[PDB]
Amino acid sequence: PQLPEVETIRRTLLPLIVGKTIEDVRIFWPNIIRHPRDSEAFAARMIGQTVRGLERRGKFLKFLLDRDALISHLRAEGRYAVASALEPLEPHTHVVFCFTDGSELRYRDVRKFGTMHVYAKEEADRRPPLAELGPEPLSPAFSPAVLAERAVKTKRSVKALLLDCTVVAGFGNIYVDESLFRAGILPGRPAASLSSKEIERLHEEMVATIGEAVMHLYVYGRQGNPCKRCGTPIEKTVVAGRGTHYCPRCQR
DNA sequence: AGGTAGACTCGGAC
DNA sequence: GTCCGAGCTAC
Ligand SMILES: [Zn+2]
């Protein structure tokens, strides 16, 4: 799920679990559990707690319980569902939170790639994986000035900068390529080479790109196809270790 | 110093 | 057998 999808998950899941009390936690793939390191401690501590809220930070879900917060990252294919304990589990179900009402919050992930961390609520923000997370891209805390400051200080490409979770929260590969296209900026450009004008324009398109989604791609995955603005074939290379898509005419 | 790159996690699709 | 996407170790 992308940031906008996580926000949608956050919004839709909350009513389905709020006020429910955990009676058991069943773990079928312990490696998903990152903190406490022992999956048996993770399960034990959550038993008896009631779900009070669900927040989002970047692509992280933060389940707020009585004492603890469960911080959950789904990566690409992780999915939550609420369903009856009487019915068979779906394939690739790795963790199940059983509620006293006979319902379950189930975490599936064919890729077994997601993570869960549990800490006392008051500690979650200063521990992994939330520690160091940059500002929400739709927040005033993410400004052209902030972006400019990170850009000047680094030798990395502008794409590498935008992919940095400490720079801005949860801006994935797709939105990075799309935003840079809309801003007219090549992804391989050194971040420090961007003019003030370019920094402003980039900030503006990041917000619009991700803002529009929280309510049709120009370049991502469209390599070999015509640019939608100028008809030039979209190209794909590797930048910052990622598949990178761009129009060599629109972007400079 | 810490910025930065690399290792590492996984399995569906070539 | 090799790729790839997000987010602790060691130069
Ligand atoms: Zn173009």
| Three-class DSSP category at A235 | strand
CA A138 – CA A155 distance, rounded (Å): 26
C-alpha A218/C-alpha A178 separation (Å) is: 6
Q: Does the annotation list A117 as a binding residue? A: no
- Helices A3-17 + A196-213 axis angle, to 10: 40
A120 CA, C7 C1': Å apart: 22
Is A247 annotated as ligand-binding?
A: yes
Placement of tokens 């005419």 in the chain: A249
Q: List Cα–Cα distances, A138 to A90, A202, A237, in angstroms.
A: 35, 13, 28
CATH (one of 3.40.190.10, 1.10.8.50, 3.10.520.10, 3.30.70.330) for A133-252: 1.10.8.50
Buried b (16+ CB within 10 A) or exposed e, A148-159: bebbeebebbbb
Q: How far apart are CA A70 and CA A5, in angstroms?
A: 19
CB within 8 A of A72, min separation 6: which ones?
A60, A61, A62, A63, A78, A107, A114, A115, A116
Domain spanning A1-132 has what CATH number? 3.20.190.10
DSSP string, A12-61: HHHHHHTT-BEEEEEES-GGGEEESSSHHHHHHHHTTPBP-EEEEETTEE
DSSP A153-213: H--SBHHHHHH-TTTSTT--HHHHHHHHHHHT--TTSBGGG--HHHHHHHHHHHHHHHHHH
Q: How far is the CA of A222 from the centre of ligand 1 (A)?
A: 12
Boundaries of every domain in chain A: 1-132, 133-252
Rounded to whole angstroms, the Cα distance separating A150 from A54 reads 30
CA–C1' distance A96–C2 (Å)?
33
Cα–Cα distance measured from residue A241 to residue A185, given in angstroms and rounded to the nearest whole number: 18
> What is the distance, to the nearest Å, from the Cα of residue A170 to the centroid of all Cα atoms in its chain?
4
Resolution given for this structure, in angstroms: 2.0
- Bond before A129 cis per omega within 30 degrees: yes
Ligand 1 centroid from CA A243, angstroms? 18
Name the nearest CA neighbour of A138 among A181, A169, A162, A164.
Answer: A169
How far is Cα A129 from Cα A115, in angstroms, rounded to an integer?
A: 9
Cα dihedral angle (A158, A163, A169, A173), rounded to 10 degrees? Answer: 120
Report CA(A252)–ligand 1 centroid distance (Å): 10
* A242 catalytic residue (yes or no): yes
